[PDB]
């Protein structure tokens, strides 16, 4: 699935 990836990408900040 892409749900975990979707969440990680929405939460990521550098």
């Amino acid at each position: 699935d892409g749900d975990y990836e979707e969440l990680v990408l929405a939460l990521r900040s550098e």
Partner: antibody, heavy 116, light 113 residues
């Protein structure tokens, strides 16, 4: 379901070396930052190290108590993250977990005992 | 560094009643983003920690809706509306605003009888 699995722990001499491994299944490791977190009854949960992606030039960050002795690395093609621990101290004893970027996924942990 | 304080080392509850678990940070966990960089975990005995809440108030996927998280910059609260036996273990807060990421000492939930 995603699964993280740590290995390489055990009993080790103070001043000695030990390399831990973490292998990911059903998880595209290459897309995510990885972390090592350890646990002891003395210090509780302690964040140890983090490794970012290839496009982040594999940027690393470490806890101060571990800086200069521990090295975190990844090998995306082996679906793995590692923790090379050198000049080990009694304080380094405990359960070592690897986790993914958002702390949803944790392995079962590997026990590291530093003693003479 | 960013110090996470959980004043209660333990908290007792009668099954089916509610509980609040407090955490505090030595600096605001609010990012210019508008998000609060705080996680809540449950560590059931003999198990690995499990995520309950991300960004101070969001339920992680598959966590029961009896859990909630709230707070204001430096003071945070995890709440369970009705405690069940599967809720016993150690509750930890964690900040990820700055390096090093830091955890509170933990609050263990105990059932009254």
């Amino acid at each position: 379901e995603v699964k993280l699995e740590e290995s390489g722990g055990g009993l080790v001499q103070p001043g000695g070396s030990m390399k831990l491994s973490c292998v990911a299944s059903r998880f595209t490791l290459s897309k995510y930052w990885m972390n090592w977190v350890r646990q002891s009854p003395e210090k509780g949960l302690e964040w140890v190290a983090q490794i970012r992606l290839k496009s982040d030039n594999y940027a690393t960050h470490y806890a101060e108590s571990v800086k200069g002795r521990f090295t975190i690395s990844r090998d995306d093609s082996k679906s793995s993250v590692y923790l090379q621990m050198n000049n080990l101290r009694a304080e380094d004893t405990g359960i070592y977990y690897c986790t993914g970027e958002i702390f949803v996924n944790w392995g079962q942990g590997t026990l590291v005992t530093v003693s003479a | 560094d960013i110090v996470m304080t959980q004043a209660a080392p333990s908290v007792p509850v009668t099954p089916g009643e509610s509980v609040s678990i407090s955490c505090r940070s030595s600096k605001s966990l609010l990012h210019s983003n508008g998000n609060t960089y705080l996680y809540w975990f449950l560590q059931r005995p003999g198990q690995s920690p499990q995520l309950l809440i991300y960004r101070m108030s969001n339920l992680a996927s598959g966590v029961p809706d009896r859990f909630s998280g709230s707070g204001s910059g430096t003071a945070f609260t995890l709440r369970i509306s009705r405690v069940e036996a599967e809720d016993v273990g150690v509750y930890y807060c964690m900040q990820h605003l700055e390096y090093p990421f830091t955890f509170g000492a933990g609050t263990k939930l105990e059932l009254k009888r």
